[PDB]
Structures are given as C-alpha cells and as structure tokens.
Amino acid sequence: MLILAIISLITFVSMSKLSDNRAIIRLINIYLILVLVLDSFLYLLFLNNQTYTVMGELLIFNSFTFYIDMLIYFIMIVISSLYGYNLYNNNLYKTLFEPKKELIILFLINILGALLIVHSNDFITLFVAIELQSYSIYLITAIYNSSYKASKASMLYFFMGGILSILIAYSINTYYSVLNSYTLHSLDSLIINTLDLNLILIALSLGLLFKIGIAPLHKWLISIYENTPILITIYISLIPKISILSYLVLSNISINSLVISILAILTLLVGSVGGLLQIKIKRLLAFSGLTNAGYMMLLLLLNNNEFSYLYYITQYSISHLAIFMIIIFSIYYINYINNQYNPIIYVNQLKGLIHDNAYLVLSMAIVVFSFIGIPPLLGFFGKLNILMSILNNGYYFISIVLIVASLISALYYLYLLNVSIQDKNNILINSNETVSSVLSYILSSLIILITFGFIYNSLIIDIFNVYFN
Amino acid sequence: DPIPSGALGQKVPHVDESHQDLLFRTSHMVEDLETYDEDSPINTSDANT
Amino acid sequence: EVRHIELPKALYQAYTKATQAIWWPTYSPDQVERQFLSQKIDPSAKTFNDLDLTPMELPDLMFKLIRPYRVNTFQHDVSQLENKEKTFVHILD
Amino acid sequence: MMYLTYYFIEITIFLAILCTIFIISAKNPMVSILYMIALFVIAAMYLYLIGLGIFSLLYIMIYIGAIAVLFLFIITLLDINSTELSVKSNIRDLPLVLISLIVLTISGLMIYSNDSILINKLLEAFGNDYNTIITQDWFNIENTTLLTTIGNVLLTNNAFILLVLAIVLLLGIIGPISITMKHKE
Amino acid sequence: MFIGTIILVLSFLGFVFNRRNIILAFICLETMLLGINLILLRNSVLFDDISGSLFAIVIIILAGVESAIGLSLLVSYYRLRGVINSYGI
Amino acid sequence: TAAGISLTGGRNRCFSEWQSFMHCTAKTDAKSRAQCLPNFEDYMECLHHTKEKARLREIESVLKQKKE
Amino acid sequence: MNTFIIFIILIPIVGFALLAVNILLAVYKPYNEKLGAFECGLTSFNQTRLAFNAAFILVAILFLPFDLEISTLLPYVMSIYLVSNYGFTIVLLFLLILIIGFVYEINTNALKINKHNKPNTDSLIYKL
Ligand SMILES: CCCCCCCCCCCCCCCCCC(=O)OC[C@H](COP(=O)(O)OCCN)OC(=O)CCCCCCCCCCCCCCCCC
Ligand SMILES: CCCCCCCCCCCC(=O)OC[C@H](COP(=O)(O)OCC[N+](C)(C)C)OC(=O)CCCCCCCCCCC
C-alpha cells in the first residue's frame, strides 16, 4: 500500500498545483486510515507467534513487526493530519504551516525505510533501508530551504549520518569476513560461545544507536531538532527511533553488554541533567527523548523484551505527539511569534496559558505526569514493565540510576506545567476564530488514551500471551 | 512581580525583539542560551532580493 | 618565494660550461666569474649629474616592473562578507 | 623476470597512502578531487590485480565518470573558500591523530580474527606468508562470469533489493528537485 | 584488507581533522565507502562468494545517490548564503 | 538468499562444510547443539585456514632452525 | 608483455613527445600583454562566482541516478537467458518505477530555463 501510495502520489503531485497539496495529504491520510482498518485482520497469521520469512529470506514478519507497522501508520496519520488541516484559517497560520509539494512523498518513502528496517532479516536489506530512511530524512530536514537553520541542520545531519553509515557498513562487512554471511539467523549458541564476536556486533549496535542520539553523540541531533521546523521535528525525532530500536530489540545483539550498559547509564544521566538549564522547548523535549531512548536501550540486554518495548514505545509515541500538538496549539496565545518556522521557542512564552485555555493545560499536565511516570497514567506502567524486566534479569545499579533519572527529568518536565499554571496579565476574553475540529479531536483522543488506557491492560496482556508467546 | 525563572531556579532571559540586534551577534554563548535567531523576520527582511 | 640555491663555484661553472653546447642563450661561466666582482666606480669619470639627470632607483619601479608576474591569489579577509552576501540572489529560479 | 610483478599490491597500498595524504594536503580542493580520482584509479588497479576487472571498469565509469564529474561541476559553480594546511592551525591534532591512527589501525586488523587472546588477534592478521594453491576443476560448463551471476542473483534471488533500489533512485530524482527548484504554483 | 583499512582510517582522520573545506568531507566519505568495498571484494574473491560483490554494487548505487543528495543540500545552503566558508559546515 | 553461490553461479569454496554443519543443526536442539562443534570448526578452517597455517609454520620452522 | 599492456602504457609515457619537441623548438619570450587575455575586459574584487540557473546544476545532479539506472541494467542484459521470464518481469517493474520519476521530472519542468523580463500581456485600460 505504501509503494502504491508513493507511485500514485508522485504522478498526482506532478500533475497538480501547489494549491492542491493539502487536499492530497488529506486523501492519503484517509487512505492510510482505510488500510489500517481493512487490512489489520492479518494479525491472525501470527497466532501462537508464527513467524514468516519473505523475499527469499530477506524479510521477517511476526507480531512484533506487524504491531510496529500499525504504530508507524498511526503516527503518519497524525503527522499528516497536522499538515492537511489548518489550525486557524488566518493569514498567519497560512504563512507558518504550509505543506511543500514533495513533503508527503518523502514522508511515505521514509516510512517505507522504517518498516524495511524493522522487517529486515539480512544485512543487505537493513543497509538499503537505513539509507532509504536517512536520505529521505535529510531531504525532509532540508525541504524548508528558506530557513538558514534548516539548511545548516540538513548538512550536519547528512555528514554525521554518513559517518555512522560507514560504521554500519564496516560492521556488516566484517561480520561477512568472519562468518561468510549477512544473516543473523546464522548465529546460535555454539557460534556465539565459540567465536568472539562482540566487537562487530556492538559496532553495528552503536552505528545504529548514535543515529538516534545516544550519548556522547547527542548534541548534533538535539541541534537538528532545535533548528528544524516544529512540524518536521515532530516526525524526525520519533520515527527513526522507533525503527532502529525495534530492529535492535528484535535482533538479540547486546544481551549482556557492558558497553551498552555504560552508554545507557550515560544517556540517562545526560538526558536528565542537560535538560535542566534548557530554556527552549524543543531542546527540552529532545533531552526527554534522549532519556526515553536510554530507558529503551536498557531492554537491549534482556532476551525477553517484547512487551516492555512495545508498551513503552507506544506510550512514548502518544505522549510525544500529544506534547508537540499542545505546543502547536499554544501558538494562538503566546504574544510574540519568533519565526515563520519555529513560532514558539522558549518555555516562558507559555506563561499564563491556563487563563486562555485551561483544558489545554489539563492535557499538558496529563502528558507531563505520564512522562514523570505518575499512576494511573500510561508512562507509569511503561516504567513498571521495564523495571520488572531489568530486575528479573539482574540489573540492580541501572535500576537505581533509572529512578534517579526519572526524578531529575521531572524538574524540566514540570518547568512547562509550572509556567503554564502561572498568572498572566492581559488574558483572553473573546476570540471569534476557532481551532480545527479534527486536530482537537486527535489531541483529545491521545490524552484520553494516556488517561484511560490502563483499563485495558489485562486484555492487552491476554492478547500478547497468545500472539507473542 | 514577574522575572522569568527556569526549571532549576536560575535566571532566564525574557526574549523580545530587543536582542535580535546586530549588537548581540558575534557573541559565543552555547547553542542553548544564544537567543540570536538568524531566521527572524527582523533580520531576514532583505534575503535573496 | 623566489627560489635560490647557493651551490659552489667549481660545480656551477662546469654546469654553465656544459650548457653552452645547446644553441640558445644560457648563464655563461664568465658570468659566475663576475659573480665575485662587485662594482668599482671610477671617480675620475663623469656621472649622470653632469647631464642634469636624476635617476630613479630600483625599489620605486620594482612594482611597475614585476606586477605582471604578481599572481594576486585572492581577496583579503572575506569575513565580514557573509551578511552582505546574504542579500543577493545566487541561483535564479 | 618472474617476480618483477610480485609487489604490485604493496605498490598500490603505498600509492593509496600517498594519494590520501595529498587529498588532505592539497591547497585548492580541485586538486583534492583530482587526487581522489587517482585513488579510484589505484583501487581499480588493485581490483584488476585480485581478479575483478569488471569492478575496475564499473568504478571507472561510475565513480570517476559521474561522481567526480559532479564534484568538479559544483566546485566550478560554487564559492568554496579554503584555509590552507598550516602549522599554527593543525599541529594541535598530532597527539590525537597519532593515538587514533595506532588504535584504529590495530583494532581494524584485530577485528577480523576469532582468537581469544588480544595480541594474537593482530599477529594472525599479519600472518600473510603462505601461498594459495589454485587447482583446476572441469565442472563449470557455462561461460558465467561475475556480472552474469550478479544479474542472476539480483533479478531472481534478490529481486526485492533491486525493486527497493528503484525507490532509492526515485529519491535521487525527487529530492534534488524539491530542494533545488522553486515551484511557482 | 590492508589497502581498505588504510584508506578508511586515513579518510576518517581527514574527515575528523578537517579545518579547511566541506569538499574534503565529501571526499573522505566517498573514499571511506571505497575502502569498505575493497575489503568486501577481497573477501568475496577469497571465499568465492557472490554476496560480497552484490553488496558492493549496491554500495556503488547507494553512494551515487548519496552524492547526488548531498550536493543538492549544499546547493540549497549556497542558495541562501552565497559562500561556503572554511567553517560553519 | 544468495548464500552458497559462487562467482560463477555455483557452489562456493566452503559449501560442503557449511552444508554438513547445517545438516547437524537440523538434527539437533539448542541443548544438543554442541555436537555440531567439529563441523563448525571445519567450516571456519575452510574459510580462514588457521590450523593449516600453524601446521606450515611448524614445518617451516623445522626447515629453518634445525638445519641452520 | 601483451600488446594490450604495451599499448596502454606506451600511450601515456610517450604522449609528451610532441610536447617536448614543441618546448625545445619553439620561441618563448613573453610580454605582459602577450601574457594578457583579451581585447578589453576587467573585473574588480567583486566576487569569485556568477549566479547560475538551477537547471545547470540539476542536469548534472540527475545524470547520476539515470546513469546508475542504465548501468544497473547491465547485469540484466548479461543474465537475460538465465533469468528467463522472471527477471524479465522484475526488470520491467524496475523500469516502470524509474519511469515514474522521469514522468515527475518532465511534469515539473525541472530542466527548463525561465525568463525574468517577461513580455507584457496585460490590456491597456483607461480610467475615464
Ligand atoms: C566509522 C568511521 C570510520 C572509521 C572506522 C575505524 C575502524 C573501526 C574500528 C572498530 C569498530 C569501532 C568499534 C567501536 C567501539 C566500541 C566497540 C565495542 O564496544 O565492542 C567491545 C566488545 C566487548 O564489549 P561487550 O560485548 O559489550 O561486553 C562483554 C564483554 N565480554 O568487544 C571487545 O571485547 C573488543 C576487543 C578488545 C580489543 C580492542 C582493541 C584495541 C587495541 C588498541 C591497542 C593500541 C596499542 C596501545 C595504545 C597505543 C597508543 C599509543
Ligand atoms: C495496533 C495499533 C496501535 C496504534 C496505537 C493505539 C493502541 C492500540 C492498542 C491495541 C493493542 C492490541 O489490541 O494488541 C495487543 C498487542 C498485540 O496484539 P496484536 O498482535 O497486535 O493484535 C491486535 C489486533 N488489532 C490490530 C486488530 C487490534 O499487545 C501489545 O503489546 C499492545 C501494547 C500497547 C499498550 C497501549 C494501550 C493503549 C490503550 C488502548 C485503549 C483502547
């Protein structure tokens, strides 16, 4: 469906004006919805965790990957809704948020690379898909070429991703030099304990992981997320992370690594501490994503990590989308538009939002306390399942570091809420412009999921026990 | 009563049109605390004209 | 940077003596002989000033004479050019 | 006469080191591109030496013929200022440069062997002493070369990666138009 | 094995310690890919295996597309700025 | 997918050892997988020729110092 | 020593023959204005580059992917018999997917040169 979509949209966008790109995005959003509705019955193939090898033995299809694909479709639906539906029908919001002509095509190609990463079973497919993701996401960072910051980020991202791709290719070709193979199915107990193979494998893991900001290589991606447009940041900060971490979780590559443990501790400490003096919103959220990436690095050392990873990545995706959507909604009440691309930059521009929109601040509070991991919300159950796994597998110092990072991160998560529930002079009394219906419904649905998804945890576990065990 | 404070109680700048000026370029603060935009409509009014 | 070597007499004189076998003019051995003979001005002889002439001297005319061989590599300190260059069109759409 | 052509792999290694140093060292980046072309020539030589002249010609027609051409195309059209290699600017790198040279080379040579003790992992990499026997079989009845087999596997056993490279090339067309062109309406 | 590791390492160092150009960064990336492909093809010959040559030709294609995209991004950067300086990417 | 294919389109140099090892893996479970240690050693020996190199080092050293 | 090898080495290490013949035989006594370059012409320290149209660089950037396409078709034409009626369909799908991008290129008019000083086409209307 994605390739059909790509081959259709290329023609239909070539033969269409720039006045039609928003409606094109709406069309393909409804297309993705219909796909996720009608074709999602394929979950029955994976009953009792039946796994399939496709295209020779180049792709792998199981419940894990089907779930990640449904999740990526859901994310693309939300991100396309943010481009296909105007928040307000004003000249300002037709200057700030306009889709460029090729943006949807590049999004769909990046989604294709994401899914061919998670579905990969041979390293040639992995490399082709990594490059199809990274080239497309370079161009996504660069499509708003009237921004100095975005062009600069485009080029930094090109070079750093290029170097890390060199690392991935070196790892792959060294694995081939040793074993004469490109497939991880070629490994077993005997081959692991007979060959020393951890340098190659951890080189691959780090080449994949530094592409999502794992410390000490975080500053460049945080600068890229800061310097890009908000509606591009929301995509480029989430989907690569899902793709690469899902590949590294499905591939059991770092089961008791000391290096990955060390770097995960470092990611937690950096992502918690460095976000304390950040005055800007996107850098704060970038460090939040960094510490969540650390929490998800921890479950690359387990060998039974599907439930924890899927729960945490789903809840982090919902929270990430919700918080970026709240920052997008808050632009109507900020008193100073900073740029055409990042209309809101600093956290103190959210001062007094409760007096203009109180339920938007209720949403912000729900998301902030899910990030902190406060029950009965969803992030609490995420953290609980992660802790369950890592303590069942014997990581006792990492657990205390995890608690300390959970505590230190709460400060910069609460910075937002604190300034939002402060008092402000020159409040809003009336406004005849109303925000969109669709985007309001999407945000409300995400917030309601965060708030009331714990009701279904029993049912989710019972389904997992049939499709993943 | 208002002076902007941060997450850790530290001083934060109130960002205006005040310091998108040519004065506050060519200073070497870190990427986090710079406050010069380089994409502001104040600076980029004559760009590729 | 003009290149100079300063190698001995018995060798350069022989190299010059050898290069007189080609047909085109080259540095002669008697010239490297004259390399040891500085100017001894005869004081009894007349001079320019008897002709009411005042010569130029080399440093004021070296510019005029050597500027054809001046390369003029690049401009000076293209920093402070960035923000003015930002206002021009560099790729025409 | 026999061993006059023995050290032609070592000569290519030496020339590659030289051309990389000249790339790093050249004043004008046009000269760096020309030395990159010379390094591609050296690699193509080495590939002929080990028996892959098809890849040598593919390299000559792709890398030198298109990529280097595009490099020259852009430096002919864009102002790319340059700071010359200096001792007041680059000499600070020597300690880290040397440390990284030693560490990276030794790790790159250690990574290829499966022996447990670390020093022996380098000593096996330098164990290039004994020659390979090339015996002849009579089982291959066809005229299959490397390009034929690449096509066979790429169009039958690996058709998916070809039909994904198609979308990669579509990106190669659609991205640059989106980034370089400005659409009117 | 030797020529490729050497080209790779020297290209990586000439990328990391480049205070001069952006063209040198492009060149060092391309030479890094070259070095990987040469190690790959030497192993392909020694094992008598096609997967290495397949991966190599795929790298050729992907590196070409990488060069095209990178030099489009540079052209956008130059659209806005007009001069690509010693520093600042 | 392209595993076990030569440069000429056929079986590679170390196919037979790999195929023996994979037969023994198909016979076995993860607890009986240690029976396939000699087969994997043979496959890796065909690949890299470590033991033959050490053997020839011994032969050469006897040709080297016990004579001169 | 094969005739191929002899020729391909001999051409480079002999090609400077007439170069040396010309360097040794011919006069060389330059002037300033013989080292010059034109009838008239000058330029102050204004810039090092001229503004160029996008198509000039886009033709080169698009040469790479289409060249790689046509070079990736070489394995097919050297494997055409062995991949009988399967690889045929596969390479047809390949060519169709790559024709979609060519269609995009044509419909966007990316290699067209646009003109700034348009001719005026608007009517002459007189307020009475
Ligand atoms: C990409 C850019 C292009 C440039 C590329 C450069 C070449 C690439 C070099 C190799 C690839 C980079 C690898 C990245 C570093 C991280 C590697 C790693 O983490 O793997 C370590 C791994 C053991 O770690 P682990 O499995 O997690 O823990 C269980 C332990 N039983 O496995 C190991 O146990 C490692 C084995 C230990 C030996 C390491 C070799 C170092 C030797 C250096 C000695 C130098 C001499 C002394 C100092 C000289 C200075 C003057
Ligand atoms: C799937 C779209 C994801 C998009 C995001 C929306 C969340 C949907 C959750 C349904 C998951 C499921 O019901 O499945 C349970 C899955 C595996 O089951 P499955 O193989 O995927 O079959 C599902 C067949 N469907 C597609 C027809 C439904 O176990 C898991 O670990 C799910 C962990 C997610 C926890 C988050 C809970 C959110 C609260 C839900 C309130 C209604």
* Complete DSSP assignment for chain G: --HHHHHHHHHHHHTTHHHHHHHHHS-----TTTS---SS----SS-S---EEHHHHHHHHHHHHHHHHHHHHHHHHHHTTTS-SSHHHHHHHHHHHHHHHHHHHHHHT-SPPP-SSPPP--------
Residue with tokens 């094109």: A24
Residue with tokens 């994409």: B39
A275, A270, A283, A264: which is closest to A397 by C-alpha? A264
**Which residues of chain E have a CB within 8 Å of the CB of F12?**
47-49
Ligand nearest to the CA of A377: 2
State the count of interchain CB pairs (< 8 A) between B and C: 11
Angle at D157 between CA D156 and CA D163, to 5 degrees: 70
Secondary structure element (H or E) that encloses residue A53, with its range: strand A52-54
With a 6 Å cutoff on the Cβ, whether A71 touches ligand 2 is yes
With a 6 Å cutoff on the Cβ, whether A220 touches ligand 2 is no
* Token pair in block for residue A162: 């290029």
Cα A112 from Cα B15, distance rounded (Å): 41
List, in sequence order, every residue forming a beta bridge with G52; answer none if it has no partner.
C91
Distance from the Cα of A102 to chain D's closest Cα (Å) equals 6
Q: Whose CA is nearest to atom 16 of ligand 1?
A: A203
Secondary structure element (H or E) that encloses residue A252, with its range: none
Cα E67 from Cα D66, distance rounded (Å): 10
Question: So where are chain G's domains?
Answer: 3-28+32-108
F-interface mutation test, from D138, D141, D149, most F Cβ less than 10 A away: D149
Cα G76 from Cα G92, distance rounded (Å): 11
Q: Return the DSSP state at D132.
A: P
Angle at A205 between CA A200 and CA A209, to 5 degrees: 150
A236, A209, A242, A301: which is closest to A114 by C-alpha? A242
List the single residue in A with minimal CA-CA distance to B19.
Answer: A338
**Long-range contacts, D43-46 (Cβ 8 Å, 24+):** D43/D12, D43/D16, D43/E3, D43/E7, D43/E34, D43/E38, D45/D12, D46/D9, D46/D12, D46/E3, D46/E38
AA letter at A309 = Y
Residue B47, chain C, CB below 8 Å: the answer is yes
Do B and F share at least 3 CB pairs under 8 Å? no
Q: How many residues does chain A have?
A: 469
With a 6 Å cutoff on the Cβ, whether A453 touches ligand 2 is yes
Contact G108, D173 (CB under 8 A): no
The residues, any chain, with a CB within 8 Å of residue A95's CB and separated by 6 or more, are A340
- Alpha carbon distances (Å) from G17 to G7, G10, G22, G23: 15, 11, 9, 10
- Alpha carbon distances (Å) from D79 to D73, E26, E84, G50: 12, 16, 6, 9
Q: Whose CA is nearest to atom 37 of ligand 1?
A: D118
Cα A468 from Cα D27, distance rounded (Å): 60
Contact A179, F40 (CB under 8 A): no
Task: Burial-class residue E75 by CB neighbours within 10 Å (0-12, 13-18, 19+).
Answer: buried
Cα C9 from Cα E53, distance rounded (Å): 63
> A372 C-alpha to center of ligand 2: Å?
23
Determine the residue of A202, A258, A297 to mutate for testing ligand 1's pocket, defined as the one with the most ligand atoms within 8 A of the Cβ atom: A202
Contact A352, A422 (CB under 8 A): yes
Contact G110, D179 (CB under 8 A): no
Which chains share 3+ C-beta pairs under 8 angstroms with F?
A, D, E
C92, C71, E35, E60: which is closest to G75 by C-alpha? E60
Secondary structure element (H or E) that encloses residue A178, with its range: helix A148-179
* DSSP helix/strand/coil, A122: strand
* Token pair in block for residue A402: 């995890």
With a 6 Å cutoff on the Cβ, whether A467 touches ligand 2 is yes
Cα A151 from Cα A268, distance rounded (Å): 30
Q: With an 8 Å Cβ cutoff, are A10 and G100 in contact?
A: yes
Cα A241 from Cα A257, distance rounded (Å): 20
> A199 C-alpha to center of ligand 1: Å?
6
Which chains share 3+ C-beta pairs under 8 angstroms with C?
B, D, E, G
Residue G49, chain C, CB below 8 Å: the answer is yes
* DSSP helix/strand/coil, A61: strand
List, in sequence order, every residue forming a beta bridge with A183; answer none if it has no partner.
A122
With a 6 Å cutoff on the Cβ, whether A452 touches ligand 2 is no
With a 6 Å cutoff on the Cβ, whether E8 touches ligand 1 is yes
CATH 1.20.58.1610, applies to G3-28+32-108: yes
E6, E69, E68: which is closest to E39 by C-alpha? E6
Scored b (16 or more CB within 10 A) or e, E14-23 reads: bbebbebbbb
Distance from the Cα of C2 to chain D's closest Cα (Å) equals 19
Residue with tokens 């090729």: A102
Residue B38, chain C, CB below 8 Å: the answer is no
Residues of D with CB under 8 A from a CB of G: 58, 61-62, 65-67, 69-70, 73-74, 77-79, 144-145, 147-152, 154-156, 159, 162-163, 165-167, 169-170, 172-174, 176-177, 180-183
List the single residue in D with minimal CA-CA distance to G95.
Answer: D166
Task: Burial-class residue D97 by CB neighbours within 10 Å (0-12, 13-18, 19+).
Answer: middle
Domain containing F66 equals 1-68
Do A and D share at least 3 CB pairs under 8 Å? yes
Residue B48, chain E, CB below 8 Å: the answer is yes
Of ligand 1's listed atoms, the one at least distance from the Cα of A261 is 27
Q: Whose CA is nearest to atom 40 of ligand 2?
A: A453
**Which residues of chain E have a CB within 8 Å of the CB of C88?**
82
Residue A91, chain B, CB below 8 Å: the answer is no
Query: What is the total count of domains within chain F?
Result: 1
Task: Burial-class residue F38 by CB neighbours within 10 Å (0-12, 13-18, 19+).
Answer: exposed
* DSSP helix/strand/coil, B20: coil
Q: Whose CA is nearest to atom 42 of ligand 1?
A: D107
**Reported resolution in A?**
2.7
Q: With an 8 Å Cβ cutoff, are G51 and C75 in contact?
A: no
Q: With an 8 Å Cβ cutoff, are F36 and A190 in contact?
A: yes
* DSSP helix/strand/coil, C45: coil
* DSSP helix/strand/coil, B11: strand
Handedness of CA D45, D46, D51, D54 (dihedral sign): negative
List the single residue in G with minimal CA-CA distance to E54.
Answer: G75
Cα A174 from Cα A195, distance rounded (Å): 13
Number of helices and strands in chain C (H, E): 4, 1
With a 6 Å cutoff on the Cβ, whether A33 touches ligand 2 is no
* Token pair in block for residue A438: 């669709």
Q: What is the 3-state secondary structure (H, E, C) of chain F?
A: CCCCCCCCCCCCCCHHHHHHHHHHHHHCCCCCHHHHHHHHHHHHHHHHCHHHHHHHHHHHHHHHCCCC
> A107 C-alpha to center of ligand 2: Å?
24
Residue with tokens 């950040």: A278
Residue F1 CB neighbours (<10 A): 23
Cα A345 from Cα B37, distance rounded (Å): 10
Q: How many residues does chain G have?
A: 128
By what technique were these coordinates determined? Answer: cryo-EM
Beta strands C91-92 and G52-53 are parallel
Task: Burial-class residue A100 by CB neighbours within 10 Å (0-12, 13-18, 19+).
Answer: middle
The residues, any chain, with a CB within 8 Å of residue D10's CB and separated by 6 or more, are none
The residues, any chain, with a CB within 8 Å of residue D169's CB and separated by 6 or more, are E61, E65, G65, G68, G69, G98, G101
Q: With an 8 Å Cβ cutoff, are D63 and E85 in contact?
A: no
Q: How many residues does chain F have?
A: 68
Q: With an 8 Å Cβ cutoff, are D158 and F5 in contact?
A: no
Which chains share 3+ C-beta pairs under 8 angstroms with E?
A, B, C, D, F, G
* DSSP helix/strand/coil, D85: coil
AA letter at D7 = Y
State the count of interchain CB pairs (< 8 A) between B and E: 3
Of ligand 1's listed atoms, the one at least distance from the Cα of A201 is 20
Cα A86 from Cα A81, distance rounded (Å): 9
Residue F59, chain D, CB below 8 Å: the answer is no
* Span between the terminal Cα atoms of chain B, in Å: 45
